Design a protein around this ligand. Structure first.
Ligand code: HEM
Ligand code: D0L
Ligand code: SYN
Length: 455
């Protein structure tokens, strides 16, 4: 039953590339999926991939015996500053499994318990900032969520204070990062990146890369000379030994891991929190239910690790926000061997796939007719959800290593926001999703009304 797969409109020798000439390429690709269905071919000069949108096909793509992680063009461009750190290495590169073995214990339960106090440090700064707003001032949500998540990975992971809440403008790092990511997303559609029209982009790309590397130097300098005894992510990077190869990470790879974790360790969690608050103010009944949980569980001025673990409904709220708007919206795979997808689409060894996660999460055959509704109760029973229906953290051994960190931070912070404030969508905000490879609301503002509960 070999089928012929659809393909969106082409532009001569540029093939489908100009379809990416937009500030919202993932959303453009979702619209193409709406029109073409669960699978479509997408070509650019010298490259073919296939976008998958249905759980029917993606459950086969998640078979690690048949498919391995591929570096998308986006990840290849990010590799220009993230090197062979965990997220931009091939599975078969020595440094992938070696760093994985070394850094996995930094996300154990016992590690999470160790990060918790510093997580609270930053969360309290967020709550205090909002308690200190004047009447009828408002909250810039993604901006403040990015302050929080950047500061949290800096402090918990590296004992470094970005002090983002002492800045009215984004930290230098954030500004460069967003620009490197902008450049990487915009470079996706460039048919001739060597055209001298892009010489300034190339120069600016290097400038932003040094800014990001300078902080990495300072983070490493401060730890090596410190007199304090740390046990955090940096500690493991500098001292951990891989059981398999027996070797620690070398200095060049450590630097790549720091860049990787500073970016991956915050940018998507700030998007998650922004989307979760958006859906909560648009769904007051859900907000109330999660606020009731927050009030019942967070009975102390400072949340404890054990209490965050009991914010189970807040946890479902976050999962449902990742369902509708997974903030890292795609991942890529290649066929390890010739194989047939869905009994219908033969693939040759090396053939590539793109998993379009926001579209997967809208598969009506899985979620039902109410698929656009925000119903955290969808997640009450993981056993009732078919395999590989829900993939906001990627797949298999290349799934997100930071998943527990992200969800613990987001549950703590959202729990505290719902404990301490009522929220008002005072502008009737119209969701507008900015793309920097990752996804985040833009211009989302709310007003908080303090419940006047002491910290
Ligand atoms: C809600 C927040 C987050 C989301 C949605 C998310 C999502 C993802 C996804 C989809 C991947 C797979 C990428 C691929 O297959 O190409 C991934 C990989 C990764 N994530 Fe996350 N992530 C989040 C938070 C974090 C945090 C906080 C950290 C660091 C503490 C982190 C570190 C990583 C790393 C290192 C990888 C590469 C893993 C490997 O291949 O060994 N992520 N993440
Ligand atoms: C933090 C998450 C980063 C990974 C998500 C990247 C997700 N892309 C970000 C923009 C759109 C989306 C994507 O579909 N990209 C493809 C684009 C592409 C396909 C075929 C030929 C050329 C280029 C790619 O990069 O290969
Ligand atoms: C570079 C960071 C990153 C984080 C999540 C998915 C892919 C890449």
């Amino acid at each position: 039953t070999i089928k012929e797969m659809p393909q969106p409109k082409t532009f001569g020798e540029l093939k489908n590339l100009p379809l990416l000439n937009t500030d919202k390429p993932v959303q453009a690709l979702m619209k193409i999926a709406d029109e073409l269905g669960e699978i479509f071919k997408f070509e650019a000069p010298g490259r073919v991939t296939r976008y998958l949108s249905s759980q029917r096909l993606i459950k086969e793509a998640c078979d690690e015996s048949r498919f391995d992680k591929n570096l998308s063009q986006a990840l290849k461009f990010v590799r220009d500053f993230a090197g062979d750190g965990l997220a931009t290495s091939w599975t078969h590169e020595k440094n992938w499994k070696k760093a994985h073995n070394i850094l996995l214990p930094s996300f154990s339960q016992q590690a999470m318990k160790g990060y918790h106090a510093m997580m609270v440090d930053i969360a309290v700064q967020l709550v205090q900032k909002w308690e200190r707003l004047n009447a009828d001032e408002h909250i810039e949500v993604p901006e403040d969520m990015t302050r929080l998540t950047l500061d949290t990975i800096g402090l918990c992971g590296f004992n470094y204070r970005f002090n983002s809440f002492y800045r009215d403008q984004p930290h230098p790092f954030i500004t460069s990062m967003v620009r490197a990511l902008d450049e990487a997303m915009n470079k996706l559609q460039r048919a001739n990146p060597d055209d001298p029209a892009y010489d300034e982009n190339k120069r600016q790309f290097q400038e932003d890369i040094k800014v990001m590397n300078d902080l990495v130097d300072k983070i490493i300098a401060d730890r090596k000379a410190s007199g304090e005894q740390s046990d955090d992510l940096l500690t493991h990077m500098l001292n951990g030994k891989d059981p398999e190869t027996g070797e620690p990470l070398d200095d060049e790879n450590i630097r790549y891991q720091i860049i990787t974790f500073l970016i991956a360790g915050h940018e998507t969690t700030s998007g998650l929190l922004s989307f979760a608050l958006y859906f909560l103010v648009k769904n007051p009944h859900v907000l109330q239910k999660a606020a009731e949980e927050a009030a019942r569980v967070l009975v102390d001025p400072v949340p404890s690790y054990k209490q965050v673990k009991q914010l189970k409904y807040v946890g479902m709220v976050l999962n449902e926000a990742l369902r509708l708007w997974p903030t890292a919206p795609a991942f890529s795979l290649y066929a390890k061997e010739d194989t047939v997808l869905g009994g219908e689409y033969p693939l040759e060894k090396g053939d590539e796939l793109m998993v379009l996660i926001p579209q997967l999460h809208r598969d009506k055959t899985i979620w039902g007719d109410d698929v656009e509704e925000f119903r955290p109760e969808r997640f009450e029973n993981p056993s009732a959800i078919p395999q590989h229906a829900f993939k906001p953290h990627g797949n298999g051994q290349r799934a997100c290593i930071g998943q527990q960190f992200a969800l613990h931070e987001a549950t703590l912070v959202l729990g505290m926001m719902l404990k301490h404030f009522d929220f008002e969508d005072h502008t009737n905000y119209e969701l507008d999703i900015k793309e920097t490879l990752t996804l985040k609301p833009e211009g989302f503002v709310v007003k908080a009304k303090s419940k006047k509960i002491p910290l």
